[PDB]
């Protein structure tokens, strides 16, 4: 209709609740449901374990 629309394809990796990450979702979002990007701090929290004898790889 003489209008440009940008469309994306995504595949889920897990579900997190609160301030911790768990593998697997078993639930899927429905249409008309927002997306909110992501921040760099949460990736650091996920990939850096709390104690548990962390071993740095790279």
């Amino acid at each position: 209709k003489d209008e440009d629309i940008f469309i994306l394809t995504v595949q889920p990796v897990g579900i997190f609740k609160g301030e911790e990450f768990f593998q697997g979702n078993s639930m899927l979002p429905s249409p008309t449901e927002p997306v909110f990007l992501v921040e760099d701090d949460i990736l650091n929290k996920i990939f850096s374990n709390e104690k548990t004898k962390i071993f740095h790889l790279g």
């Binding site: 697997g24 078993s26 004898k53």
Partner: protein, 117 residues
Amino acid sequence: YGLSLMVVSQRPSEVSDTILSQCNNFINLRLTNINDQNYIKNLLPDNSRSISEILPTLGAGECLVVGDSTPIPSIVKLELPNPEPRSQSIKFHKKWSESWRTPSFEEVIMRWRKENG
């Protein structure tokens, strides 16, 4: 004669097909290997194969139940037992963070010969 078997395994593709063919009830947890998924699909009914695509995405505490005892194959979430099973490892990394320890070799070089050999 009144005898039953519960077979627990994590590599279904390496167990004998003679014994796994007598199984009527299947409890499936998360699987990430293609061969195991294919073998399970071949063993499971077609309707369960249609919903089997959720095996790689199953979370913690959720299992797929298939068999005659259930009216519909389903996904069930279970609860943790009390008390809980636990193993006994030695925690290589935790022990490697301590100070240097010297074992007593005089005692351990014995018991190789209990009395005279």
